[PDB]
């Protein structure tokens, strides 16, 4: 006669751990890559030589 | 000092011995990245086959 | 004889995407005059509890 | 997984202007811990003599 | 399940002598929270009166 694990049952609590949760974010790269315009309205001309 | 370790009654037989022990846990994070789902997070280098 | 490891290229600047948006056998990369570019951002990422 | 955003018109009335739902999603890893050991006996008169 | 128990003479060669061995038990079981509701709907001008 003696005591199992199985026989503990739910006296010995399971584990949370959130160190392999976090995952860094990415930004989008033509914001990084190009020249940005802040816009105040839907649409903006740009005329160009043609 | 005092215990039965194979068939040596460790003490009556003047012994002692060395009880060594760990305990280890082993986790790989091998979930989705900014790239997609099911990424593997090592490669390997490998002799070639006889 | 790997040749180019101490390679970087002629002044450009060099942006690598790691948002998964680069498909898989369509394109290695691209070379531009970011100065040809606008991204216009009217708005930039905005959140809405509902 | 990851959710995925669209692309969406101004509509009252058309599907096209309607912002779609999608689900990000997670999944268990685990660190389940397990016993190594070894027991090193030996006699007390040979310690000593060492 | 319950641990056994008897009672043990002093004896260094007799059965009785010896101690017994007995094993105690546990099983699970679980509190899982489910939810019970009711909307109750109502003109506000109604609410304003009252």
């Not at chain 1, 816009?39 to 740009?46: A, E, I, P, S, Y």
């Not at chain 2, 460790?10 to 790239?35: C, P, Q, S």
């Not at chain 4, 990000?24 to 060492?50: F, G, K, S, Y």
């Given at each position: 006669a003696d005591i199992s694990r199985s026989e503990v049952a739910t006296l010995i609590q399971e584990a949370y751990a959130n160190d392999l949760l976090a995952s860094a974010k990415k930004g989008s790269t033509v914001l990084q890559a190009f020249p940005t315009v802040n816009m105040g309205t839907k649409t903006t001309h740009l005329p160009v030589l043609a | 000092d005092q215990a039965t370790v194979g068939s040596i009654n460790l003490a009556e037989r003047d012994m002692i011995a060395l009880r060594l022990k760990a305990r280890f846990a082993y986790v790989l994070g091998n979930g989705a990245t900014a790239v997609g789902d099911?990424?593997?997070?090592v490669g390997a280098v490998v002799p070639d086959g006889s | 004889n790997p040749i180019f490891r101490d390679e970087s290229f002629n002044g450009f600047g060099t942006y690598f995407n790691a948002n998964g948006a680069w498909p898989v056998g369509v394109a290695e990369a691209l070379v531009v005059?970011?100065?040809?570019?606008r991204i216009g951002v009217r708005q930039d990422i905005t959140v809405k509890f509902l | 997984t990851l959710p995925g955003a669209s692309w969406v018109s101004e509509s009252?009335?058309?599907?096209?202007?309607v912002k779609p739902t999608s689900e990000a999603t997670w999944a268990d890893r685990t660190l389940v811990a397990e016993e190594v050991a070894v027991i090193i006996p030996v006699h007390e008169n040979v310690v000593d003599d060492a």
């Amino acid at each position: 006669a003696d005591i199992s694990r199985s026989e503990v049952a739910t006296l010995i609590q399971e584990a949370y751990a959130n160190d392999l949760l976090a995952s860094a974010k990415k930004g989008s790269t033509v914001l990084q890559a190009f020249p940005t315009v802040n816009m105040g309205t839907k649409t903006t001309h740009l005329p160009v030589l043609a | 000092d005092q215990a039965t370790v194979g068939s040596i009654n460790l003490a009556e037989r003047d012994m002692i011995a060395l009880r060594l022990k760990a305990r280890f846990a082993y986790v790989l994070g091998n979930g989705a990245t900014a790239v997609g789902d099911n990424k593997t997070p090592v490669g390997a280098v490998v002799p070639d086959g006889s | 004889n790997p040749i180019f490891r101490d390679e970087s290229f002629n002044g450009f600047g060099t942006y690598f995407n790691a948002n998964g948006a680069w498909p898989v056998g369509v394109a290695e990369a691209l070379v531009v005059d970011s100065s040809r570019v606008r991204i216009g951002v009217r708005q930039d990422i905005t959140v809405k509890f509902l | 997984t990851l959710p995925g955003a669209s692309w969406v018109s101004e509509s009252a009335t058309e599907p096209e202007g309607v912002k779609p739902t999608s689900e990000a999603t997670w999944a268990d890893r685990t660190l389940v811990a397990e016993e190594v050991a070894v027991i090193i006996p030996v006699h007390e008169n040979v310690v000593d003599d060492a």
